Amino acid sequence: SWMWNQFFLLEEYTGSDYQYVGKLHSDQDRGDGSLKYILSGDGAGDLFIINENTGDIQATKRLDREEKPVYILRAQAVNRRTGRPVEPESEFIIKIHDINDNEPIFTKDVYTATVPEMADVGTFVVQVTATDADDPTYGNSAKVVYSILQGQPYFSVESETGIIKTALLNMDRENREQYQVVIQAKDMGGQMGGLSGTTTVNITLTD
């Protein structure tokens, strides 16, 4: 069975007037003003308001998907003068749809790691991770790619995983023992307009 009883509402609305949600409507409404639509449930009456004559629903406040992603409501259609139901009461949901408004955040601002000197190219150093609070199931808003801002050619980072590896042969601890790497995480798959964060990785060569 198809699931139709839902509305989709963009988060973080900043328009001047109220944000339009959609319209409840019974195919028994002849538009003669004898029918009344009633909204109840989570947010009914303040956050979500209805035009009782037409079924039009509006949202009265800017909503944040990361705070609350879905609202469960109920719809009624009744005779205006008797209150007798014309449609059976029915549940429906208002789904808050994601925009890319959260930047990647690294689990640590400073990572500490070691790797042996004279390691072969590709030796594992450390894995960094940036989380993203946007919706991973739609679009690229939460798809993070890693890149090295500081530390090439001594090190590399896997773009999809944040795994840092050695990238230069014959690194001598006696020459330089400590390396400070900076990694960037950018969402939207690293594409134009993506939001970004950075972290610092202090790497010490061992024997």
Window 171 to 200, contacts with a second copy (CB under 8 A): 193
- Output 3 or 169, the one with its CB closest to a second copy: 3
- Output 37 or 179, the one with its CB closest to a second copy: 37
Strand 19-23 with 56-59, pairing: antiparallel
DSSP letter for each residue of 72-119: EEEEEEEETTT--EEEEEEEEEEEEEP-S----EES-SEEEEEEETTP
- φ and ψ at 190, to 5 degrees? 80, 10
Q: Does residue number 101 form part of the binding site for Ca ion (CB under 5 A)? A: yes
Under 8 Å between Cβ of 77 and 26: yes
Selected from 38, 66, 80, 97, the binder of a second copy by CB under 8 A is 97
Stretch that binds Ca ion, among 23-31, 54-62, 75-83, 131-139 (CB under 5 A): 131-139
Q: Does residue number 10 form part of the binding site for a second copy (CB under 8 A)? A: yes
Under 8 Å between Cβ of 180 and 145: no
Q: What is the dihedral of CA 37, 41, 46, 48, to 10 degrees?
A: -60
Binding partner selected for residue 14 from Ca ion, a second copy, none, CB under the kind-specific 5 to 8 Å limit? none
Applying CB under 8 A, the residues found at the interface with a second copy are 1-8, 10, 16-17, 20-28, 54, 56, 75, 77, 87, 90, 92, 95, 97, 137-139, 193
Applying CB under 5 A, the residues found at the interface with Ca ion are 64, 66, 98, 100-102, 132, 134, 141, 172, 175, 187
